[PDB]
């Protein structure tokens with residue numbers, strides 16, 4: 244009886260196995276754009292993805308992860324609210340059963356069709372498993388998806404999904420350039436939070452871009468053909484794999500932009 248996104252194992256149940264679900268710095272949150280304050284002492288983000296080395300794509304039964312070689316500073320996030328160097332390890336998405344839901348963060352209560360998470364770990368902690376035990380261990384760059392024009396840089400991901408339909412399937416996924424998933428502007432909101440899936444560790448500096456990317460209805464429809472189940476088991480479409488907004492508690496959301 245493991246955690247998931249059903250009625251009987253979804254977000255409202257996670258606190259039983261993971262009591263930090265009710266903690267002081269949980270994610271996602273609603274971003275109230277009129278309450279977020281411009282912080283002129285933030286810097287610009289530095290997203291350095293030119294030497295990124297993608298390796299594999301995995302259906303883990305909750306989402307799919309595009310995994311990177313993180314054994315050197317090949318693809319790193321720095322600047323903005325961050326001190327030091329954060330190495331890209333994987334990205335994944337959260338998405339809905341229909342276009343009006345799917346994002347984890349919300350903006351003035353607006354839900355986007357999906358949300359991309361580029362996960363990075365603080366190299367001062369040496370490995371990812373050590374980093375998740377630290378309050379400044381991870382930096383997640385979150386990017387909203389809206390349905391409209393196709394995103395050309397997403398299509399290589401879309402087309403490999405047929406090969407990883409079910410939980411536990413992987414495929415080689417080399418030479419994928421995550422720069423093709425970025426919007427034009429790097430304006431962002433930032434706040435201290437958590438993983439949005441169990442174990443819900445409070446180790447993340449969230450950096451949520453203001454500008455969504457556009458993907459086509461056909462692209463998101465292909466996400467919705469994935470399965471939560473394993474091969475040879477009854478089909479459960481991988482949709483609505485998002486955690487709703489959590490209480491902001493004693494946090495401030497800061498804006499990089501006026």
Ligand SMILES: CN(C)c1ccc(S(=O)(=O)N[N+](=O)[O-])cc1
Nearest residue numbers: 399401402403404405406407414
């Ligand atoms: C040789 N064939 C049949 C083949 C090759 C690649 C693809 S793909 O769309 O890049 N990947 N995929 O499906 O998972 C599909 C079919």
Ligand SMILES: CN(C)c1ccc(S(=O)(=O)N[N+](=O)[O-])cc1
Nearest residue numbers: 360362375381383437438439440
């Ligand atoms: C420790 N790793 C596995 C990890 C960290 C953070 C995330 S997330 O971007 O907060 N989304 N999510 O939790 O579902 C995902 C994975």
Ligand SMILES: [Zn+2]
Nearest residue numbers: 335337360439
């Ligand atoms: Zn995520």
